[PDB]
Each structure stands twice: as C-alpha cells, then as structure tokens.
Amino acid sequence: MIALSQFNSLSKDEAAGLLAPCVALPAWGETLVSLRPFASRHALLQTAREAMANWGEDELNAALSAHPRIGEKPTGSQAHAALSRQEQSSVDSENERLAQALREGNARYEARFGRVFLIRAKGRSGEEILQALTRRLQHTADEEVAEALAQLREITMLRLEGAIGE
C-alpha cells in the first residue's frame, strides 16, 4: 500500500503498473492515471467507480482472462496470483466434497453461460460461493452478465483500496 501523495507523483508507467493487478482492463487504469493528481483518496475511489460504470459484456470477458476459477488457487508469488489466493482464503481446500461441488458447479455454470463463474471471493466461504452459484444458475443471460459485472466492480475496488492509502 502506497500513500495518495506518492501515487499522485509517480511516473505514468509506475502508476499504471501499480493499478494493473486490480483488473485486466488497461483503459480503466489509464483513465485513473490520466486524471491525477487526486484531491483525496475519496475522490480517487469515486472516480474509479465512475470509470467502471459503463462496463459491459466485452469488459467482463476481457477481465476474466486474469481470474482463475474458484477452487483453482494460483501458486505464483506475483501480485495477481497472490491477490487471488488471498481472496479465496475462506475457501476450505481440504474439504473434498466442497472441491468436487465447486468443480461441478463451475462446469455447470460454464456450460450454461459460456464464461468462468465470477464472484467477489474475499470473505466468502466455499459454501457461500456454492449457494451464490446455485442461485445464479437460474438467471437469464442478461441478469447474469449484470451480477458478474457487479462482482467484478467489487473485486476491482477492493484491490484498489488495498493498493492506495490515505
């Protein structure tokens, strides 16, 4: 976590590099970098929310390139992999029934919608995620695109909030 005044003074490449792990959508980060300096962390976060307001199915698809499946915890030490592992920390990997249910739930979701199941995993157990998956399997395509995008927005914001402090 770096301070706001520090973020405001970074070179364009260093600032974009800092924001890159939040979401695999270069336009989002580029917008934030281009609008520096920010008056406050409050203003930065608000601007960040505004910049994700017009995201659609195309953004969902592009962002999903950097998100592993729930239950498929990455091992890498780099920000992306470390963040995902940390976000899935409430998922019990030792529970064999859960692991199998997650694999089956994922396959079922992917067959239905054509994309990986996306959920803000931070603070959610494997059971909570499974129940969300069961609920979201009943959605129309548009309803599901909307929720998946809402979850993407949450993931991105939490990562941003963890990257830049007051």
Ligand X SMILES: NC(=O)NC1=NC(=O)NC1=O
Kindly list the residues in this chain that would bind ligand X in the complex (CB under 6 A): 67-70, 84, 87-88, 116-122, 155
Amino acid at the residue 121: A
Q: Which is nearer to ligand X, 30 or 147 (CB)?
A: 147
* Matching residue, tokens 């997650």: 102
CB of 1 to ligand X, least distance (A): 18
**Rg for the chain (alpha carbons), in Å?**
17
Q: Give the span between the Cα atoms of 148 and 44, in whole angstroms.
A: 23
CB of 62 to ligand X, least distance (A): 14
Instruction: Answer whether the bond into residue 68 is a cis peptide, omega within 30°.
Output: no
Query: What number of residues does the chain have?
Result: 166
Q: Which is nearer to ligand X, 38 or 117 (CB)?
A: 117
Q: Which is nearer to ligand X, 33 or 118 (CB)?
A: 118
CB of 87 to ligand X, least distance (A): 4
